Amino acid sequence: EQTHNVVHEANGVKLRETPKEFFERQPNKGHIHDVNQYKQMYEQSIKDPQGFFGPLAKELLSWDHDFHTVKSGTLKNGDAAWFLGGELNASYNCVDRHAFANPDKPALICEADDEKDSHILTYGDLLREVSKVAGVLQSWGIKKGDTVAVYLPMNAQAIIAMLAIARLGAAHSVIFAGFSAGSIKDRVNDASCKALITCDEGKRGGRTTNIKKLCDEALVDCPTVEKVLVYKRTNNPEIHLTEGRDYYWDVETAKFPGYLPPVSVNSEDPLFLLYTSGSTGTPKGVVHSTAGYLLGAALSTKYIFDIHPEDILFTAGDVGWITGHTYALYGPLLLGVPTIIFEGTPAYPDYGRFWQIVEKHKATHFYVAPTALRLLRKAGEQEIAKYDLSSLRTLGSVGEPISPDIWEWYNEFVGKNQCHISDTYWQTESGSHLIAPLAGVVPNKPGSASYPFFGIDAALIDPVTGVEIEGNDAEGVLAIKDHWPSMARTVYKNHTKYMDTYMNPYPGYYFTGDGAARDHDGYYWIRGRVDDVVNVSGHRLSTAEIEAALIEDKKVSEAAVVGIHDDITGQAVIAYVALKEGNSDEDSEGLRKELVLQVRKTIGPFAAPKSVIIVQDLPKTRSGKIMRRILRKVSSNEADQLGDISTLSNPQSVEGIISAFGAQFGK
Amino acid sequence: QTHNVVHEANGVKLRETPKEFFERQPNKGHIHDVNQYKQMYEQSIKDPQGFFGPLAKELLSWDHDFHTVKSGTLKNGDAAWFLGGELNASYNCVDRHAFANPDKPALICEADDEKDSHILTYGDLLREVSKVAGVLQSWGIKKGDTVAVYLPMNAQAIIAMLAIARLGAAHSVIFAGFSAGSIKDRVNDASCKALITCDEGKRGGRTTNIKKLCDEALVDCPTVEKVLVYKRTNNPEIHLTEGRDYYWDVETAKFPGYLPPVSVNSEDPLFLLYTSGTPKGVVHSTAGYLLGAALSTKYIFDIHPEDILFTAGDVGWITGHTYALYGPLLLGVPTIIFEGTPAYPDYGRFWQIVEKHKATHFYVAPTALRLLRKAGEQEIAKYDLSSLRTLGSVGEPISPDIWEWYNEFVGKNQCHISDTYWQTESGSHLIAPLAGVVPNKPGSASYPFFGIDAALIDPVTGVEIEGNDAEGVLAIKDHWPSMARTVYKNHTKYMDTYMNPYPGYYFTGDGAARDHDGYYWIRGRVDDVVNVSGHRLSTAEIEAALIEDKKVSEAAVVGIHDDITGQAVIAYVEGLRKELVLQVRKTIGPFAAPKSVIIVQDLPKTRSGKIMRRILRKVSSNSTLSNPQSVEGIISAFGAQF
Amino acid sequence: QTHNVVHEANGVKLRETPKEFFERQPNKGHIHDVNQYKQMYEQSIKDPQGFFGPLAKELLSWDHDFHTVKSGTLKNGDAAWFLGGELNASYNCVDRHAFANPDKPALICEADDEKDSHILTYGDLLREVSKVAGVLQSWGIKKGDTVAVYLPMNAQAIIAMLAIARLGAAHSVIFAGFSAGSIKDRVNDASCKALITCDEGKRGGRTTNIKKLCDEALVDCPTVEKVLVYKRTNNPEIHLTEGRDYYWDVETAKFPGYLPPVSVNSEDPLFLLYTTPKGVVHSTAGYLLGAALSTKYIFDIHPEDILFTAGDVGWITGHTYALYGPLLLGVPTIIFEGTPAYPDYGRFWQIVEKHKATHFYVAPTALRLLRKAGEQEIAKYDLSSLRTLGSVGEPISPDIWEWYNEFVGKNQCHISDTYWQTESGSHLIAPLAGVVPNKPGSASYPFFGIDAALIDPVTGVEIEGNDAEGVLAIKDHWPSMARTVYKNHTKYMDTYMNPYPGYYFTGDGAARDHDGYYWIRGRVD
Numbered sequence A: 001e002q003t004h005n006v007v008h009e010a011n012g013v014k015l016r017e018t019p020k021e022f023f024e025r026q027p028n029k030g031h032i033h034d035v036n037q038y039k040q041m042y043e044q045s046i047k048d049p050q051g052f053f054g055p056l057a058k059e060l061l062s063w064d065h066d067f068h069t070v071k072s073g074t075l076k077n078g079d080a081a082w083f084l085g086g087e088l089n090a091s092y093n094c095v096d097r098h099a100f101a102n103p104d105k106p107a108l109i110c111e112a113d114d115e116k117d118s119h120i121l122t123y124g125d126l127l128r129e130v131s132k133v134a135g136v137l138q139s140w141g142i143k144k145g146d147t148v149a150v151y152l153p154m155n156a157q158a159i160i161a162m163l164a165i166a167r168l169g170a171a172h173s174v175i176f177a178g179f180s181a182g183s184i185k186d187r188v189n190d191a192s193c194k195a196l197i198t199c200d201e202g203k204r205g206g207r208t209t210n211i212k213k214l215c216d217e218a219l220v221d222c223p224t225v226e227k228v229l230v231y232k233r234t235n236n237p238e239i240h241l242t243e244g245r246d247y248y249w250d251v252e253t254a255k256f257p258g259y260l261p262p263v264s265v266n267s268e269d270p271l272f273l274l275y276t277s278g279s280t281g282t283p284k285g286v287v288h289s290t291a292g293y294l295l296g297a298a299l300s301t302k303y304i305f306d307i308h309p310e311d312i313l314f315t316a317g318d319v320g321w322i323t324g325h326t327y328a329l330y331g332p333l334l335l336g337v338p339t340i341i342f343e344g345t346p347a348y349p350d351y352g353r354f355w356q357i358v359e360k361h362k363a364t365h366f367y368v369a370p371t372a373l374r375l376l377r378k379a380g381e382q383e384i385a386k387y388d389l390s391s392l393r394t395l396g397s398v399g400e401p402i403s404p405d406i407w408e409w410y411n412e413f414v415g416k417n418q419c420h421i422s423d424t425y426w427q428t429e430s431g432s433h434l435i436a437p438l439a440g441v442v443p444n445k446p447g448s449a450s451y452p453f454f455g456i457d458a459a460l461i462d463p464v465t466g467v468e469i470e471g472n473d474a475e476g477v478l479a480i481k482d483h484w485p486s487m488a489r490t491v492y493k494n495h496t497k498y499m500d501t502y503m504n505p506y507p508g509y510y511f512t513g514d515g516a517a518r519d520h521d522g523y524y525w526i527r528g529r530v531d532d533v534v535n536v537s538g539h540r541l542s543t544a545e546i547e548a549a550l551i552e553d554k555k556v557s558e559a560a561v562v563g564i565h566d567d568i569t570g571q572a573v574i575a576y577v578a579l580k581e582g583n584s585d586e587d588s589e590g591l592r593k594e595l596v597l598q599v600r601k602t603i604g605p606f607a608a609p610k611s612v613i614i615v616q617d618l619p620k621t622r623s624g625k626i627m628r629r630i631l632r633k634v635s636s637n638e639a640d641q642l643g644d645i646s647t648l649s650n651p652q653s654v655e656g657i658i659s660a661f662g663a664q665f666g667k
Numbered sequence B: 001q002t003h004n005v006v007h008e009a010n011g012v013k014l015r016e017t018p019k020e021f022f023e024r025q026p027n028k029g030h031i032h033d034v035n036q037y038k039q040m041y042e043q044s045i046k047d048p049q050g051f052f053g054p055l056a057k058e059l060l061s062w063d064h065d066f067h068t069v070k071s072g073t074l075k076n077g078d079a080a081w082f083l084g085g086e087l088n089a090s091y092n093c094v095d096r097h098a099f100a101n102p103d104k105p106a107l108i109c110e111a112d113d114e115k116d117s118h119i120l121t122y123g124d125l126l127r128e129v130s131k132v133a134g135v136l137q138s139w140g141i142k143k144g145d146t147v148a149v150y151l152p153m154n155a156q157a158i159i160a161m162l163a164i165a166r167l168g169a170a171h172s173v174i175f176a177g178f179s180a181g182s183i184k185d186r187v188n189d190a191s192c193k194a195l196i197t198c199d200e201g202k203r204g205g206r207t208t209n210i211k212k213l214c215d216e217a218l219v220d221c222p223t224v225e226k227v228l229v230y231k232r233t234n235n236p237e238i239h240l241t242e243g244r245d246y247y248w249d250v251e252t253a254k255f256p257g258y259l260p261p262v263s264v265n266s267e268d269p270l271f272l273l274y275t276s277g278t279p280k281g282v283v284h285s286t287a288g289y290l291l292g293a294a295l296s297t298k299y300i301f302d303i304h305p306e307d308i309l310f311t312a313g314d315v316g317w318i319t320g321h322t323y324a325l326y327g328p329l330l331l332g333v334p335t336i337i338f339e340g341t342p343a344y345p346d347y348g349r350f351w352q353i354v355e356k357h358k359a360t361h362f363y364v365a366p367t368a369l370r371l372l373r374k375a376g377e378q379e380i381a382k383y384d385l386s387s388l389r390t391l392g393s394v395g396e397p398i399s400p401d402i403w404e405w406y407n408e409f410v411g412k413n414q415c416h417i418s419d420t421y422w423q424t425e426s427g428s429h430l431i432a433p434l435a436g437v438v439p440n441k442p443g444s445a446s447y448p449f450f451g452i453d454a455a456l457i458d459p460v461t462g463v464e465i466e467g468n469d470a471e472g473v474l475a476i477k478d479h480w481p482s483m484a485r486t487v488y489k490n491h492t493k494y495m496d497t498y499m500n501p502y503p504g505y506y507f508t509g510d511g512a513a514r515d516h517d518g519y520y521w522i523r524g525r526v527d528d529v530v531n532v533s534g535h536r537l538s539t540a541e542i543e544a545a546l547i548e549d550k551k552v553s554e555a556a557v558v559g560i561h562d563d564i565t566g567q568a569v570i571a572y573v574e575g576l577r578k579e580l581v582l583q584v585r586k587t588i589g590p591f592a593a594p595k596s597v598i599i600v601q602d603l604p605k606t607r608s609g610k611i612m613r614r615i616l617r618k619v620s621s622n623s624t625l626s627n628p629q630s631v632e633g634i635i636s637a638f639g640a641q642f
Numbered sequence C: 001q002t003h004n005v006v007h008e009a010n011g012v013k014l015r016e017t018p019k020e021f022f023e024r025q026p027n028k029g030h031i032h033d034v035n036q037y038k039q040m041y042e043q044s045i046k047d048p049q050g051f052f053g054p055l056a057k058e059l060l061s062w063d064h065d066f067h068t069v070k071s072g073t074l075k076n077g078d079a080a081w082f083l084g085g086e087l088n089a090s091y092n093c094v095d096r097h098a099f100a101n102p103d104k105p106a107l108i109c110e111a112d113d114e115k116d117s118h119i120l121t122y123g124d125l126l127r128e129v130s131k132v133a134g135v136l137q138s139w140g141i142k143k144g145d146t147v148a149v150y151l152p153m154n155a156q157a158i159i160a161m162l163a164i165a166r167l168g169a170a171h172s173v174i175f176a177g178f179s180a181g182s183i184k185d186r187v188n189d190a191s192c193k194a195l196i197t198c199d200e201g202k203r204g205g206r207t208t209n210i211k212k213l214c215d216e217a218l219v220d221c222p223t224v225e226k227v228l229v230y231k232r233t234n235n236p237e238i239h240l241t242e243g244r245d246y247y248w249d250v251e252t253a254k255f256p257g258y259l260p261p262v263s264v265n266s267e268d269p270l271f272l273l274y275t276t277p278k279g280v281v282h283s284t285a286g287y288l289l290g291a292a293l294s295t296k297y298i299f300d301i302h303p304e305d306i307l308f309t310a311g312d313v314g315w316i317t318g319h320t321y322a323l324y325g326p327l328l329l330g331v332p333t334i335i336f337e338g339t340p341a342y343p344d345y346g347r348f349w350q351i352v353e354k355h356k357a358t359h360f361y362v363a364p365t366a367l368r369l370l371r372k373a374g375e376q377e378i379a380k381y382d383l384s385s386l387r388t389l390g391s392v393g394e395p396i397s398p399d400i401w402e403w404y405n406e407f408v409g410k411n412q413c414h415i416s417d418t419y420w421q422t423e424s425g426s427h428l429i430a431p432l433a434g435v436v437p438n439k440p441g442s443a444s445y446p447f448f449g450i451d452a453a454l455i456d457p458v459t460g461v462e463i464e465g466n467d468a469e470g471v472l473a474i475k476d477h478w479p480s481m482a483r484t485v486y487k488n489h490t491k492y493m494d495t496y497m498n499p500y501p502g503y504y505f506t507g508d509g510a511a512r513d514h515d516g517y518y519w520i521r522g523r524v525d
């Protein structure tokens, strides 16, 4: 039909064909001829993964040992594997092979917080630095099967460190540089990292950040860390190094030669751990394989973004998140193109920084978070007209609900109505894109991620019956019907948590945690999390971890944290706190600031609640457990719709929550 | 037609394979007849490169190709096969079959009590092996380590062995009936870094103290860093030592159901198997042993993909290693792993298992057959055993009468019987009738198997005996793929035991006879000669000769390695020493005199009164007895006369 | 015709290789004449990929193929060859020849006293190396470890080096004449986990205190967990420390005569050779190719030939031309433990005659010693099996060159004055036997892959044209070039690559005459 009774988003939405200028700027014949070819290849990727992914793995990856079996295992048994028997090395495929072919080709276009510190590393340069750092790590005893923590800003050293660790067959664990000391401690200890790579201080938005200081604080409780390599980012002499543990990047790398042989690893040996927050309270180390993850990165970077050897990719993200892993580092470097590594913020020295960088380097592909787009539309629209952005042809949206208005704003003010937009849906555990419009191929519906990608057999499941929904104009739980090459393989030393989270809720399926709708054309519309996970400014947060942080403050007796819509950050965190012996509304403002600072120092500045609400007690059930549902409805001004609260043990509390929120949220 | 030497063979009619064997056989046999067998056998002896090369590539999956089929000689103790090759044993026994047919049964596990029986598919097995291998890998187990297994004959023993091989470490299976002292000797000789066991066992309805005996042994096993403990009974009173012992279920739950196998070289050790003198760790290679296991299981038993093998043995012995685990799993067929006894809950259990699973092949020790004949004969007829076509006898003297009983009461005179001759150090069958191919003579093992150039040797001269109707020492003229490669960290004992007694041959320690049809009849153990500069001496004859001297109270004679004369004889019992040496020369012969006669007042014996010759051997080469104090005196006494 | 700069070249007649060289040669030479050499040489400079690639596949056996022949630059100190390839040095030196002909002699061992001499076939050598490697493996030695060797020039030293390489570990040979302090400095710089030595040594009849010097050094070498001690004299008064020192014979007896070799990457280190003492590091594939290539073409070695390098494995000379070079090519090599003077000054010649050696390689210092004290001894022995006479690595004056040529060579042999250094791995400039005519005192033409040049020291600019003098420098790296100084790559850059960026600095001055022949003039320091 033409009308939708379920997928209201899709009603009256005209398809948006790729503008003709995209093809004028495309340097070669596209990788896919048209949408009909896409659908034929997609069906083969589902019906015959062996015949589809086999040849692509042999085209796009360089193997030290051939694989004998494309695909093994099932979701239900949590034993997925790809390219069994194969051996390869990630740093060889991202660096060496390109350096041998064209050593002077740019690899890392590094834009520092202050442009005067910007520089460019060629693939040849990259090979020498990666070899030297791997040389240091090898002399420290790092070997295949070890884990190594990285705590670095988004710059050349973070990329070099990751590739040097992979060069030895060890697994890197990158810890976002905005994390607090406690967050560093939790991740380092779960992985039992033998070494850490960090720097003395950072520069962000003109400010100096305390990086090494936080490591020292965390490391007093990290007994497995034997050595730390410290890069002189500011060269501040007041930054202390602990004798016998900490060593300088420049001093140690000067001891080793600019070539070190890469270590062959099996396709299914771990490439990295990436700690993620869930509905648990403790971070879980998501583990990615080597071959399957790398194939997914190359495949999605090539086909969804339409990347060619002549192109230049600017992923405005951070390696602390999966976005930087896959689309700032592995994807582009696998394909041998330059990637722009941006250390600063979109606002410094002014709101034109993104566009100055695109123009400076003639970037052809730009990949950004809707959170930044909303900020730039609000505060920096007047900066765009100052820059020539005609080198661009593909505009990606990293992964957040994008409204049709922002889609149109992005399309008009950045793309001049001449670029293709790729709203990519995916998650840390998918490794690479799951649903996205292929640049130059798939027509767009603004706000829809469009079609599932190669190897992704998406489905909607009825939340009442657990049964897969046939046909279109449907909505339900978003699930995937078979595993795919870049799917996460386990949670580090906690495979049971992995099973309970992803494979057991809907047996036979992978559970994304999202709800979605599928319209009459088969386009998917993401409707957001069904599992109460909260994403603030593109960053996935654990409400339970924030509650635990607030409870550490001994003035607090109970804490409940929920998420709500926010026009800036997508979602915001609202914290409800009951104090032990408080009162004094003159101390309210002050005690609220103290609790926010508590979360800032325990988790990190980016997990701080938007607002802390002081209440006399929280709503609970007969069993005594907190009813967050009530807090959610109140915090979104849906006080009506609470319904029958006679089932609570303390219904009288609800009145207090409605009034406290209406009094305190503003102020 | 008549035999003047091989009396066993006189008047023995050849027993052709019953027609029903071929009716039950699911496909054309692997060999048409005895003429084809002999053509293939001659190639396996004259042209091993051209014979075993193609079979190795057919039957095994390689990570790296081999460049040389065969290297080394018996005389130099440097046998090697498929040099340059790389492979993994668990990949060949599990992964490749799981990818092809994950739902095919792999381990048919019959527990002591049938209520606890279960079946693991090849897909199931891969996941369990991967998870346990993950635990061991997180503990630091890697290529070149040894890991001890002390488990009953059940799925966990099989999983443990394969998980250890998956990492390229070598497993050392310790029979679960062994005492604490027996565990300690084996763990320490191998320096195992980890141990896999269970809390308690179930045998014949009784509860056995498995973990308790391990704890007792481990107080003197400093190399064991961690222990993985399966909850076989889940008895809450079984203590786990904090920081050392961990639960199988708790740890394997942390790891995924796939873990990459580790490639090893063809000649990297697959396992140590300790023999029950001092226990010695028989070391087997990877590629050659696996090829021997698959080849003998395929051709001697006539195993096809449709078949089902029930080896009523134990992984604590080579029988379980080769024909309960590696042989059948290599060929991708199901194998029946039986934890109990032939008598529990009743004397029909063996036959109830065969009927339940429609086993096509049954392999058992004559010792078990004699028990069932004595106490449970009438139970056999109560079960449908018509799925069987091959009945194997594991390896012990089977009389013609037991052969006929086995053939009639179990096989209903419709099955082929395979009396297999082999030993721990041979890895796989040496002499056996190929099922459906070789006609039987009851009590004869028949023809040597592929790659086995068997011979009869005169025990005095070591010279090969030509022609048939002959008897002598059973010896092998060249090494073979699954031949044991060394004794762990004691290669000189290996040489002295197998290669040096009869230079140019492998010494089986057995005597045998060869009849006019070329069939071998195993005649049992020879009496342990010591080779001194080409003269073979009997320690027992020297002891007896010394004892004839009425001034002598006790005498014990032992052999030890010697760099010039090969071995030397030391006798434990200035003028009397000369008289005793002269006594041996005039009684036995001029070249039989001991290198030295040492005067001692006493030396160790056991409760049975048998002399602990091991003690003297170690003393002459520089508490467990019934008279421990005795040992002390000789530390000086050996230093006194020698 | 005249030289205004290269005064050494004036009035020097070319010395064609004598006629008898080709009569004694067992097969058609590997290169026909100087013109064919210059065609091959130019390809090795212009197109190293197409020249060395095929040669690497011809002369070495690979466990994994390489994907790239050559990588890196001198200026960046990141040279690499045969990238991606895997191989094992002991497989190429032992296993593959043992399989083909196990009874062919490998180590012709002449002891300090001839009564103790013996010969190991390739089959023999595989068993002894397997057993020693089995000992080291049981001790935990693995790829990436270093093992120190403090042994005289005898079978045990060759077996130890090969057994360490068999496991993919790196051997660090310490000349048996070094003091305890010299042992300590090397052992600690390399952090060796094990040491292989002997109880005592025999040199010129005298007994040397070998284990005793080790024991003194080991008090300050905490990384050494175990020591393997060969009973060279079997002196019972030599102390072994309980729990650290073990006997070679006692431990090897426990292990079998075959052990699988361990694959290493082309650019994994094969050995550290210390020259304070700096550890020169040599790759595996590049070094081995250089060793086989120079031994084959400069010395004209054929499968039937027999090489006598009168050197010591404590120096690079024994590494490349007593062990790796000849064993790679599958020919016998003579390992001489003694001195040219004991029991008499006819020892070298009695050995050449005894084994019908075809090639002899020695330093001029020994030549000067024999000319002074043992010239009459030469005539007593039959040296008619020789055809190539080598000069290891010192300035050979025309007088010595003429004496060497007449009295040892009977004016029927070719002489190869080889110029090279520890850091070059193998010969840099040398006359190819049966190909390059000689000028006494001149090393002649650069070898394959060696693009030699002269640099004006004052200006640092490369000197065009001939009749020139200046600093000797190489313009691109070569397969056997040392890759670093152990854990001190900055000292490596400062010494070799930074003085003249874009060049490899030899530290020597040289002259190039109108024919292109090079005359080594000595250190610039």
Ligand SMILES: Nc1ncnc2c1ncn2[C@@H]1O[C@H](COP(=O)(O)OC2CCCC2)[C@@H](O)[C@H]1O
Pocket (backbone or CB within 6 Å): A321, A322, A323, A398, A399, A400, A401, A402, A423, A424, A425, A426, A427, A428, A429, A449, A512, A513, A514, A526, A528, A529, A535, A538, A539, A540
């Ligand atoms: N195109 C999209 N449109 C709407 N919502 C989206 C879209 N992509 C992702 N999400 C939500 O983000 C979660 C994943 O979070 P995370 O693992 O941090 O990955 C982030 C960071 C990099 C990729 C996203 C999904 O499960 C969804 O809820």
Ligand SMILES: Nc1ncnc2c1ncn2[C@@H]1O[C@H](COP(=O)(O)OC2CCCC2)[C@@H](O)[C@H]1O
Pocket (backbone or CB within 6 Å): B317, B318, B319, B394, B395, B396, B397, B398, B419, B420, B421, B422, B423, B424, B425, B445, B508, B509, B510, B522, B524, B525
């Ligand atoms: N078919 C046979 N007929 C008569 N005797 C036989 C036969 N097979 C073996 N033996 C004797 O058992 C020793 C080997 O014992 P073992 O290594 O424990 O192996 C056990 C477990 C597997 C085989 C037996 C032989 O050397 C012989 O003396």
Ligand SMILES: Nc1ncnc2c1ncn2[C@@H]1O[C@H](COP(=O)(O)OC2CCCC2)[C@@H](O)[C@H]1O
Pocket (backbone or CB within 6 Å): C315, C316, C317, C392, C393, C394, C395, C396, C417, C418, C419, C420, C421, C422, C423, C443, C506, C507, C508, C520, C522, C523
């Ligand atoms: N044919 C030669 N003519 C004149 N001088 C020569 C010649 N060969 C080398 N040198 C000098 O020896 C140094 C190298 O010494 P070393 O590294 O010990 O290697 C030497 C000793 C062991 C092997 C060679 C060169 O740099 C030069 O100074």
Ligand SMILES: [Cl-]
Pocket (backbone or CB within 6 Å): B581, B593
């Ligand atoms: Cl006597």
Ligand code: NA
Pocket (backbone or CB within 6 Å): A064, A065, B064, C064
């Ligand atoms: Na390989």
Ligand code: NA
Pocket (backbone or CB within 6 Å): none
């Ligand atoms: Na390999």
